[PDB]
Design a protein around this nucleic acid. Structure first.
Ligand SMILES: [Mg+2]
Ligand SMILES: [Mg+2]
Ligand SMILES: [Mg+2]
Ligand SMILES: [Mg+2]
Ligand SMILES: [Mg+2]
Ligand SMILES: [Mg+2]
Ligand SMILES: [Mg+2]
Ligand SMILES: [Mg+2]
Ligand SMILES: [Mg+2]
Ligand SMILES: [Mg+2]
Ligand SMILES: [Mg+2]
Ligand SMILES: [Mg+2]
Ligand SMILES: [Mg+2]
Ligand SMILES: [Mg+2]
Ligand SMILES: [Mg+2]
Ligand SMILES: [Mg+2]
Ligand SMILES: [Mg+2]
Ligand SMILES: [Mg+2]
Ligand SMILES: [Mg+2]
Ligand SMILES: [Mg+2]
Ligand SMILES: [Mg+2]
Ligand SMILES: [Mg+2]
Ligand SMILES: [Mg+2]
Ligand SMILES: [Mg+2]
Ligand SMILES: [Mg+2]
Ligand SMILES: [Mg+2]
Ligand SMILES: [Mg+2]
Ligand SMILES: [Mg+2]
Ligand SMILES: [Mg+2]
Ligand SMILES: [Mg+2]
Ligand SMILES: [Mg+2]
Ligand SMILES: [Mg+2]
Ligand SMILES: [Mg+2]
Ligand SMILES: [Mg+2]
Ligand SMILES: [Mg+2]
Ligand SMILES: [Mg+2]
Ligand SMILES: [Mg+2]
Ligand SMILES: [Mg+2]
Ligand SMILES: [Mg+2]
Ligand SMILES: [Mg+2]
Ligand SMILES: [Mg+2]
Ligand SMILES: [Mg+2]
Ligand SMILES: [Mg+2]
Ligand SMILES: [Mg+2]
Ligand SMILES: [Mg+2]
Ligand SMILES: [Mg+2]
Ligand SMILES: [Mg+2]
Ligand SMILES: [Mg+2]
Ligand SMILES: [Mg+2]
Ligand SMILES: [Mg+2]
Ligand SMILES: [Mg+2]
Ligand SMILES: [Mg+2]
Ligand SMILES: [Mg+2]
Ligand SMILES: [Mg+2]
Ligand SMILES: [Mg+2]
Ligand SMILES: [Mg+2]
Ligand SMILES: [Mg+2]
Ligand SMILES: [Mg+2]
Ligand SMILES: [Mg+2]
Ligand SMILES: [Zn+2]
Lengths: 118, 23, 112, 69, 83, 181
RNA sequence: GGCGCGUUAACAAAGCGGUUAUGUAGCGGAUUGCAAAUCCGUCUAGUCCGGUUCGACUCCGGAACGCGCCUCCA
RNA sequence: GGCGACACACGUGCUACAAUGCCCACUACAAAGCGAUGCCACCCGGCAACGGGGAGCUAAUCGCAAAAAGGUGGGCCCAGUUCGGAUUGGGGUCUGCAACCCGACCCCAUGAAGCCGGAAUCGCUAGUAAUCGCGGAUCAGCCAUGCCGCGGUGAAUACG
RNA sequence: CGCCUCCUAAAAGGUAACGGAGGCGCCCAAAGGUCCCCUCAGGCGGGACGGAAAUCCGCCGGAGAGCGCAAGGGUAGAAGG
């Protein structure tokens, strides 16, 4: 549990390894390194704890992450479901939420096919 | 790939612009 | 009578492969009618064709008032259409037969 | 305790990346941690992180009020 | 969403009712057809009968659902399931 | 009999606050820490391996005390378990070893818990003892990601001489147990 | 009545103290103008009651039902 | 309000599964079309979509314009990855009276399935197939990955 | 059809019926000798995975557990671990 509670891969670069935390893309990768002056191309195997504890201090303090982001979004859908919004409706039944078609695909959200008789 | 709107190729495919492909 | 559960025996009449197909139409017509009546349907005897229909189907209509309504469907039902088994685009007059019967008892037999 | 079977305990110094230092005893005489009691959010009072919310949702948008009376 | 530079949209023949109500001592049932209208804090407590194409759905309005439209809560397709 | 920072705090800081809070008349009436019993209810090591020997290696680096096996009282078909199998390790910590362990549990280990929002206020025995359960053993400082090879949690039992829950709740909180609710 | 054998899914029929029987059918797909045949896949189980055992479709005891055999001399 | 539904099933496609690839930066070479509540140069604010300005053109004149693979350089190092972009959360832009059902686009976060696909099955004989981007009609916007087009790079094999 | 346990069996022993119910034809190299140590089933509460039930803590719990296998007797002041 190195940074933000998640050990980040070594033998890789810092900007690509920061992505391996839930809550950081290429953007916040590029950001936290510039905004802390840490070479984005360093092997994680070659970082003194100065860069480490500085980078971690930025990353944990700046953005809502790992469990916080997961718990926050968990309340979000829950809230839509509670009130009875359409997006909450379609979160109860596990269907599309952003208005896709359902007659055919939706298999990412409706899981594997459940072939019936017909 | 041409589906990742978060890249230049994806912006080319959709013909739109943005950060990852600016004009 | 009118209040007891009913049994419907759909048989294919003159028409051959398409009589059985029309019988399949009358079959779906009564199962779907039954739902729009709250009546409960279960199959007791089915005899399908590979073309999709049945030479014979028997099914019950479990509902307080099934015989009162379904009893008007007994008789010969005539279809005139261009069958899916026809290849020269002709109109064929075919028949299916519907039998409507009150659900019998099962009364046990002992000697007096 | 039985000899030969137990890891000997030596006086240990445990350093957290916030500069906190804790004199304890351990199997290792020096361990470096990234969190501790002195700098943990739940510990440092509230130390409410980026979630100083108020939500603020949603009536606390107020983004408008222009619509007539 | 509707552009921020524009005004947060309410059909105003329905906001009028809620504020005229807030004066005279509400709250009765307000049958509307304006599903398209966003919900405003002026309607919390009220019960609006949002039509769904067939019928009028009473919807009580609470603070966890301000930014939403009134038609999200009067859905239009009765599903039940399959089988 | 050595000085442990949390041990001083019990005598110096905790004892008088407890007397002040409950009004005991005898020096032995005031709650005390009896023991901490740490059980890894493994049971994966039923027929899969003697994986215990690695968990004992790490449970010993965490507490300085070599644990001791626990064997199945009976056989259970569903658990794929026959009576007598090595299904867990238990280590009993007393005195200085008990103090040294909690001192690191409260200060550095409970903080390293992911998304730690306090200890459960209701996990009290009903009779003045407390039990918490952990999900993984890297929470403790002596265990790293390199020498680890599997996520094994545990159950921690802290036994006190307090007759009521309220007396025990005061003792732990005064020691440094961060209670959630 | 006695003695023997049995009850498994849609049907027929096996092994087994822990474990996809099998054939055909049924269900999804392919092929075909269509249907068969064929090809790729797939699926539903142990009569009831009580025991034994960590664990019973499997072993024990009994009940119901079915089958086979016997019921002779006075 | 529905035509947009979703236990399922088929057709037609797009995007992939990666290194002959992906990424970023810089540097090239088309054709055919469209355009006065229209095309929008250029400028500024905005990470951006865009917004505010603002020339020129009733158009071989002005604009849509970037063509893309291509080229140079650096990076990734064979992993569900700097492959893939589905899903969902949050924050925005625009059109239109109005974007709940049910719009498109932008940014941040999320990074699913997929490791080249069973029986089977389609296209194509040369500037063809493959690959690469560009324009139109319809049209407020757009669910276009569709259609009709347009050129760039450019094969294999045909005994019979 | 021999052997074991209970009942019938009429409070010593014994006691029959094609009376009511069950079991044996083994096993254990420790499941034997001795010394030393230990005490159950179950109920409630508490505890990551972990459930009715795996292991851990506490309280109550004299024996209702256990003792290879039938039943009976016996049995933790051990014959049980
Ligand atoms: Mg990430
Ligand atoms: Mg859509
Ligand atoms: Mg014909
Ligand atoms: Mg005192
Ligand atoms: Mg010691
Ligand atoms: Mg409690
Ligand atoms: Mg106590
Ligand atoms: Mg550690
Ligand atoms: Mg059998
Ligand atoms: Mg059978
Ligand atoms: Mg056989
Ligand atoms: Mg056999
Ligand atoms: Mg089979
Ligand atoms: Mg088939
Ligand atoms: Mg066919
Ligand atoms: Mg059983
Ligand atoms: Mg049984
Ligand atoms: Mg079984
Ligand atoms: Mg059985
Ligand atoms: Mg039996
Ligand atoms: Mg004779
Ligand atoms: Mg239509
Ligand atoms: Mg839809
Ligand atoms: Mg298919
Ligand atoms: Mg398509
Ligand atoms: Mg397809
Ligand atoms: Mg146009
Ligand atoms: Mg992945
Ligand atoms: Mg996978
Ligand atoms: Mg990608
Ligand atoms: Mg969104
Ligand atoms: Mg819409
Ligand atoms: Mg990726
Ligand atoms: Mg690969
Ligand atoms: Mg030709
Ligand atoms: Mg390509
Ligand atoms: Mg196009
Ligand atoms: Mg258009
Ligand atoms: Mg004899
Ligand atoms: Mg004998
Ligand atoms: Mg006697
Ligand atoms: Mg007696
Ligand atoms: Mg006597
Ligand atoms: Mg007498
Ligand atoms: Mg005698
Ligand atoms: Mg006798
Ligand atoms: Mg006699
Ligand atoms: Mg005798
Ligand atoms: Mg017997
Ligand atoms: Mg016998
Ligand atoms: Mg013995
Ligand atoms: Mg013995
Ligand atoms: Mg001995
Ligand atoms: Mg117990
Ligand atoms: Mg319990
Ligand atoms: Mg338990
Ligand atoms: Mg006993
Ligand atoms: Mg036993
Ligand atoms: Mg026995
Ligand atoms: Zn610290």
């Amino acid at each position: 549990a190195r940074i933000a509670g998640v050990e980040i891969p070594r033998n890789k670069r810092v900007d690509v390894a920061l992505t391996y935390i839930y809550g950081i893309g290429k953007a916040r990768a590029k950001e936290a390194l510039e905004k802390t002056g840490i070479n984005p191309a360093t092997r994680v195997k070659d970082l003194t704890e100065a860069e480490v504890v500085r980078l971690r201090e930025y990353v944990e303090n700046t953005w809502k992450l790992e469990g916080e982001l997961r718990a926050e979004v968990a309340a979000n859908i829950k809230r839509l479901m509670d009130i009875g919004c359409y997006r909450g409706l379609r979160h109860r039944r596990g269907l599309p939420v952003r208005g896709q078609r359902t007659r055919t695909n939706a298999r990412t959200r409706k899981g594997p096919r459940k072939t019936v008789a017909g | 790939g041409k589906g990742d709107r978060r890249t230049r190729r994806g912006k080319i495919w959709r013909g739109t612009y943005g950060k990852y492909r600016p004009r | 009578m009118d209040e007891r559960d009913a049994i419907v025996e759909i048989r294919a009449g003159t028409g051959g492969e398409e009589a059985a197909l029309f019988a399949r139409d009358l079959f779906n017509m009564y199962l779907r009618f039954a739902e729009e009546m709250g009546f409960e349907t279960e199959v007791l005897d089915s005899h399908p064709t590979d073309l999709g229909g049945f030479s014979k189907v028997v099914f019950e209509v479990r509902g307080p008032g099934a015989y009162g309504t379904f009893k008007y469907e007994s008789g010969v039902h005539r279809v005139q259409r261009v069958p899916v088994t026809e290849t020269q685009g002709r109109i064929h007059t075919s028949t299916a037969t519907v039998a409507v019967l009150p659900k019998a008892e099962e009364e046990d037999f002992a000697l007096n | 305790m039985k000899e030969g079977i137990h890891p000997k305990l030596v006086p240990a110094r445990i350093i957290c990346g916030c500069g906190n230092v804790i004199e304890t005893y351990s199997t290792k005489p020096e361990i470096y941690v990234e969190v501790c009691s002195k700098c943990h959010p739940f510990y440092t009072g509230q130390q409410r992180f980026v979630d100083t919310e108020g939500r603020v949702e949603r009536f606390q948008r107020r983004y408008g009020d222009s619509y007539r009376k | 969403p509707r552009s921020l530079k524009k005004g947060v949209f309410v059909d105003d023949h329905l906001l009028e009712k809620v504020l005229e109500l807030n004066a005279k001592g509400e709250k009765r049932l307000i049958k509307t057809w304006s599903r398209r209208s966003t919900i405003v804090p002026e309607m919390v407590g009220h019960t609006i009968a949002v039509y769904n194409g067939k019928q009028h759905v009473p919807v009580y309005i609470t603070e966890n659902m301000v930014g939403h439209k009134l038609g999200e809560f009067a859905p239009t397709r009765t599903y039940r399931g399959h089988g | 009999p050595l000085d442990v920072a949390l041990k001083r705090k019990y005598y110096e800081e905790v004892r008088p606050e407890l007397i002040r809070r409950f009004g005991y008349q005898n020096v032995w009436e005031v709650p005390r820490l009896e023991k901490v019993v740490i059980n890894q209810g493994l049971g994966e090591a039923k027929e899969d391996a003697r994986i215990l020997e690695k968990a004992a290696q790490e449970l010993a680096l965490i507490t300085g005390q070599k644990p001791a096996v626990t064997r199945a009282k009976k056989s259970i078909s569903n658990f794929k378990l026959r009576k007598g199998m090595p299904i867990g390790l238990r280590v009993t910590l007393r005195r200085d070893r008990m103090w040294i362990f909690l001192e690191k549990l409260l200060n550095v280990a409970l903080p390293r818990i992911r998304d730690f929002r306090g200890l459960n206020p209701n996990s009290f025995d009903g009779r003045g003892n407390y039990n918490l359960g952990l999900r993984e053993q890297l929470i403790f400082p002596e265990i790293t990601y390199d020498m680890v090879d599997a996520l094994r949690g545990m159950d921690i039992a802290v036994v006190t001489t307090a007759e009521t829950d309220e007396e025990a709740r005061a003792l732990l909180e005064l020691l440094g147990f961060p209670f959630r609710k």
